[PDB]
Amino acid sequence: RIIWGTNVSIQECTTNFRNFLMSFKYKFRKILDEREENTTDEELYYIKQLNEMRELGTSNLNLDARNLLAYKQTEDLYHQLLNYPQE
């Protein structure tokens, strides 16, 4: 569904974002950064945070935009964020 005010369609964004939240790893960040490597062999970072929050009920998920940026096929969202935060 296209938005009348942002023309940023929902379904594609949510679909990519979902497996984004499941494909996420520390390494993407490391490659862009170029820092020396383990992070316990790069466990899934988002499910880490998500499980921890679910157990802690924080219901608030901090996030560094550059992380979402450093992952393939998300830069679209990475910029739409800077451009359509309200939605």
Binding site: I2, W4, G5, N7, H79
Partner: protein
């Protein structure tokens, strides 16, 4: 009373003056008007500074072939009205290619315009069988 005192200034004659007053000029070699309207339609510029030297040069050329300043000495703003609205009337469209994620407020207002245009050519047509102000499309 309610007078209507005729003065030598006018807009319809100034309208025709503007119609002839188009891009066409020599040094301004491609006229700087043309390339700069490209540039602003290539979206790397918004301030199209229109000096007064080339104005009097265009006047001199038109006179040797066949006053604007004295006209802008009172209002100077009805000129910004006609002049700009005609730069809209004479705006190079296909200057360069277009994207959807190359900007903001240029793809979005085009979306609005053209989508409400589809919805109008559909809804008023179903009834059969608002006016977007030029400011909305200035971008300079």
């Amino acid at each position: 009373a309610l007078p209507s005192i005729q003065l030598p200034v006018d807009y319809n004659n100034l309208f025709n003056e503007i119609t002839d007053f188009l891009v066409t000029f020599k040094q301004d070699k491609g006229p700087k008007y043309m390339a700069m309207l490209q540039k602003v339609a290539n979206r790397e510029l918004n301030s199209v500074i229109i000096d007064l030297d080339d104005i009097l040069q265009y006047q001199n050329e038109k006179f040797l072939q066949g006053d604007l300043v004295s006209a802008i000495q009172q209002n100077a703003n009805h000129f910004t009205e006609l002049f700009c609205r005609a730069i809209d009337n004479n705006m190079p469209l296909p200057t360069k290619e277009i994207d959807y994620k190359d900007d903001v407020l240029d793809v979005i207002l085009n979306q609005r315009r053209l989508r409400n245009e589809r919805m109008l050519s559909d809804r008023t047509n179903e009834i059969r069988s608002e006016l977007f102000p030029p400011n909305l499309t200035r971008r300079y």
